[PDB]
Each structure stands twice: as C-alpha cells, then as structure tokens.
C-alpha cells in the first residue's frame, strides 16, 4: 500500500481496550515514544475485496475530528490498523463515568466536534451506518470523534418507490441518529426511551412520540435535536446547518 | 461441511456465464448426474459470509428453488454444486421461444416463481434482485428462484428513523413489486421495463402514478394481480401467499 504499510517490529502490543466483530482493539506504542491504537482483524471476518475499499476511504478522507490513520499492516496476517490513541475512550462511558463534572457549556462543544466530522463525511457522500455516543471516541483533551471503519456510499425498473425515495434521501438517517445523540450527550449517557422496549419505540415514534428535553439542555438546544426529529426526512436538516445552529447557540449562550 | 462435500475430481468441468463472486460452469457428476459448478474467487467474500450462506443454502429446500447438490471447501477457488437448469435464464427463454409459449404456460411461469416467493416469505428471506434475469428455466419449462446472496429481516430502534423501521416492517412488500414487473416480462415476452424511458425517467414516471401497461397476452384478471403489486403504499400491496393464491384462481378460470 505504499508508505501507509509499516514495520511490525516496531510496534509493542500492551493492553486491551475492546473486542469487535471485525477484529480486536489492543493498546501500544509506536517505535515506544507515541500512544497508538491497533486493531487485529479476524482471518475471516471480512473479504479481500472488503479490505480494499474500507482502506481505500481511510486514506482517502481526513479531518480533525475524524479517527486520524497512522497506517496499516497488510504484509502479514493477522492484518493490523494504527491509528491514534483516544485516552478517554468511548463518549457513552464518558458522559456517564465523568457525569456532571463537565459544565453545560461544554456539553454542545461535544455536539459540534460530532457535527463538523459528519459535515465532512457529508460533503463527501457518506453515511454513518451506527452514529450514536457508543460509537464515539474522546481524546485527552476532550474532544469526540467519529471513526472511519465500516462507512457507506451514496435495479430502478423492479424497484418501488418507497426504494426510490430512500436511494435520495438516505441522508436524513444521519440526521436523526444525531438528534438523539445531542440526547445522549445532554442526558450523560441515559439509554433513549428507557422505559421501552424495541417494539414499543418503533410504535411511539411512528405515533409522534419524541424524546423529551435533557434537563441540561435549554430551550433553544433542544430546537436542534428536535429539528432533527421530524417525520418527513426531506423536512429535516443537515449537518452545515446544524452546525451552524450549533455555533449559533455557542455563541448567544458564551 | 459433512455430507455436502463433493470430490472435485468426481466433477468434470465440460462454460455458461460469470458473476461478480465467480464463474458458473457446466459439469456432471460421476457421469450420472447433471449440475453446475460455482468457482467463487477468492477475495469475492468472506470465511464468515459463506458459512452465512451455505449455511441458508443447506437449511432451505423447495421444488422451485435451486436444489443443491454439495460443495467442495477443501480447495481454493471454493466450489457450489448445484443443479443443471437446461433451458438457462428466464429471460433468455422468454426471447428465445417468443413463438411457442400458450396462454396457461405464461401464467404456469408466474406461479413457479411465487410458489418460491412465498416459501422464502414464510422464512422470512428476502431476494435483493428479484427480476426474470435472476430466474433460472429447467427443462420441463418449470421456473426456480435462487437463494445464493438472500438477506433476512441491525437496525437500532432507538436511534433509527421514522422511514427505516417502516421500511423494516414491510420489507417483503419490495418484493412484490418486483413480482409484479417480473409478469409483465413474462406476458411480454421478455420486453424492457418502460423500454421508452431513462432511469431518471422511469423513476418520474412511478412517482406520477403511472405503470406499465397491459401486455395484450395477459388477461384482464392477470393484469389485476401484476396491477395489484404495484401500489404507492406498501402496506396496501398484497403479499405473496396472496399473489399464489390468486393467480391459481385465474388458472382454474382460464383452464
Ligand atoms: C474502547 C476504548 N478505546 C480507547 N481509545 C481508542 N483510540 C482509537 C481506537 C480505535 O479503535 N480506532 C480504530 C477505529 C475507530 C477503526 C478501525 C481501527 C481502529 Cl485502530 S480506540 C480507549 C479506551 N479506554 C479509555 C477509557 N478507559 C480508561 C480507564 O482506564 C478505559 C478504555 N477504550
Ligand atoms: C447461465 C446459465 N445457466 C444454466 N443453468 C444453471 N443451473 C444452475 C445454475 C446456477 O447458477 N446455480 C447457482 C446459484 C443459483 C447460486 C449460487 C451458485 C450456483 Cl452454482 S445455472 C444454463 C445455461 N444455458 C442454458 C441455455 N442455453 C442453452 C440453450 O440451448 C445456454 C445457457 N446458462
């Protein structure tokens, strides 16, 4: 793959972070000087050709606030993936292991570091297939970021048209998705609609039912989320103007 | 993967097509039996999709479906056997013998293709591309579906939308439409889908509310069932233990 292969020695395998279906997260350190994450892909969790273009889209895209790619090891199997260390790990933990010892005011700038990576991902046609605080990572520094692993892209004569309009639109999914994250962030981790099941969600949100408004929320933040949460997804907005509405509100309540 | 195995060598290789996953190949089995062979690349799927596949290929079982005769995992390229369909694809078939079909052959097609349908209905399996080019005609004229490449029916509920988990529930009603487009290929005798249109116009074109029209072979109650498998709503449309058991109604109607 070019300068993106690096040298396995020079890696150090140290700790365990978490265990995924494609692969196992370990902790180490890159030549003993920086932190770095690597992943260990199971032999047959995913395709060669899978491979291919999962890689192609991590060296192809970057952003600040996108999981950044320090390289990969495809010369051996196992493969590895090197990519920068998060210390503070998944957001849901976060919000709820340090829960109320951040002030409100930096709660939305959580939202927007969310907001400007799917902005990018956005100009860029791509959809999260699974935005929520789980999925999220914070660095030291407290900064949220999104991770390139597992996006996607975006027969018409035996389709029908509710296939039509979803190959349009598709869009909106991750707008909805993060309306109930800033959900997630402003409750610290409460588990949306907690007193539901999977089948009684579905129903109450087919019959209007939205989630209610965090507590450390204001009015005008839960105008954002709930802005996310309208029926028709064409009604819906997207990631620049939510950014923008975010750092509206950043700056009217700063 | 126990029984399935077959030895290679007890296959001989005499070509029909390709696909994206590998080559299809023509063979017989010991010199007795008839089947064709799937050479599957090797960087086309996944350890984990095949066991997911075959898998679904060993556990499902239907007269109108593509038997399967086994598989060989202990070589690379990995094998599929299964059974030989004489006449080959149904649109092909369609063309190709647009001057010797009768009225109650056509409508024999249909119900070859939603006796299969509702069999995967009832597993609650899913065909990605139902369409006359992804069925297979023996040689007794007798339609199959294939199950090679299904999907069943994760979606998170709490954080999905309103037109996800929608679509989530009446994900077979997808397939009806494209039965309903699969008939007219048959009663028109393999003709395009609004062959005077574009893709982008086409899409318009439903969006207005217009469908394909009747072809003049197909009845007027045989077009009600195609008809009734194209409509906007998808709750509205019927389902394939439905459509089967219409179309044997207008059989015995008109026979
Ligand atoms: C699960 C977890 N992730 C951590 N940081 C990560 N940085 C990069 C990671 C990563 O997976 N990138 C990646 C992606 C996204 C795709 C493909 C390939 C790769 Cl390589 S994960 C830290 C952490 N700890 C911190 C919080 N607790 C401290 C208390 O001791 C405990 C747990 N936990
Ligand atoms: C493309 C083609 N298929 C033929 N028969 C087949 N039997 C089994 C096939 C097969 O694909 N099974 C399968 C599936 C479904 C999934 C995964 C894996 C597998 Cl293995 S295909 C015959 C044929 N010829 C007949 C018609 N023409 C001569 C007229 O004189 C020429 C062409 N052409």
Same mark, same amino acid.
């Given at each position: 793959?070019?300068?993106?292969?690096?040298?396995?020695?020079?890696?150090?395998?140290?700790?365990?972070?978490?265990?995924?279906?494609?692969?196992?997260?370990? =902790?180490?350190?890159?030549?003993? *000087?920086?932190?770095?994450?690597?992943?260990?892909?199971?032999?047959?969790?995913?395709?060669?050709?899978?491979?291919?273009?999962?890689? $192609?889209?991590?060296?192809?895209?970057?952003?600040?606030?996108?999981?950044?790619?320090?390289?990969?090891?495809? $010369? *051996?199997?196992?493969?590895?993936?090197?990519?920068?260390?998060?210390?503070?790990?998944?957001?849901?933990?976060?919000?709820?292991?340090?829960?109320?010892?951040?002030?409100?005011? *930096?709660?939305?700038?959580?939202?927007?570091?969310? #907001?400007? /990576?799917?902005?990018?991902?956005?100009?860029?046609?791509?959809?999260?297939?699974?935005?929520?605080?789980?999925?999220?990572?914070?660095?030291?520094?407290?900064?949220?970021?999104?991770?390139?692993?597992?996006?996607?892209?975006?027969?018409?004569?035996?389709?029908?048209?509710?296939?039509?309009?979803?190959? $349009?639109?598709?869009? $909106?999914?991750?707008?909805?998705?993060?309306?109930?994250?800033?959900?997630?962030?402003?409750?610290?981790?409460?588990?949306? =609609?907690?007193?539901?099941?999977?089948?009684?969600?579905?129903?109450?949100?087919?019959?209007?039912?939205?989630?209610?408004?965090?507590?450390?929320?204001?009015?005008?933040?839960?105008?954002?989320?709930?802005? #996310?949460?309208?029926?028709? /997804?064409?009604?819906?907005?997207?990631?620049?103007?939510?950014?923008?509405?975010?750092?509206?509100?950043?700056?009217?309540?700063?």
């Amino acid at each position: 793959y070019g300068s993106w292969e690096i040298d396995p020695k020079d890696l150090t395998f140290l700790k365990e972070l978490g265990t995924g279906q494609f692969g196992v997260v370990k =902790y180490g350190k890159w030549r003993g *000087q920086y932190d770095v994450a690597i992943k260990m892909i199971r032999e047959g969790s995913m395709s060669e050709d899978e491979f291919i273009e999962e890689a $192609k889209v991590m060296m192809n895209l970057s952003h600040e606030k996108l999981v950044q790619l320090y390289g990969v090891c495809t $010369k *051996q199997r196992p493969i590895f993936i090197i990519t920068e260390y998060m210390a503070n790990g998944c957001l849901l933990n976060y919000l709820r292991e340090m829960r109320h010892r951040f002030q409100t005011q *930096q709660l939305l700038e959580m939202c927007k570091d969310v #907001c400007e /990576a799917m902005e990018y991902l956005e100009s860029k046609q791509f959809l999260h297939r699974d935005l929520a605080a789980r999925n999220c990572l914070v660095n030291d520094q407290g900064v949220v970021k999104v991770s390139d692993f597992g996006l996607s892209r975006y027969p018409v004569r035996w389709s029908p048209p509710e296939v039509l309009m979803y190959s $349009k639109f598709s869009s $909106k999914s991750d707008i909805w998705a993060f309306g109930v994250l800033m959900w997630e962030i402003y409750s610290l981790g409460k588990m949306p =609609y907690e007193r539901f099941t999977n089948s009684e969600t579905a129903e109450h949100i087919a019959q209007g039912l939205r989630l209610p408004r965090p507590h450390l929320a204001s009015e005008r933040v839960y105008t954002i989320m709930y802005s #996310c949460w309208h029926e028709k /997804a064409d009604e819906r907005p997207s990631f620049k103007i939510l950014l923008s509405n975010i750092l509206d509100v950043m700056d009217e309540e700063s």
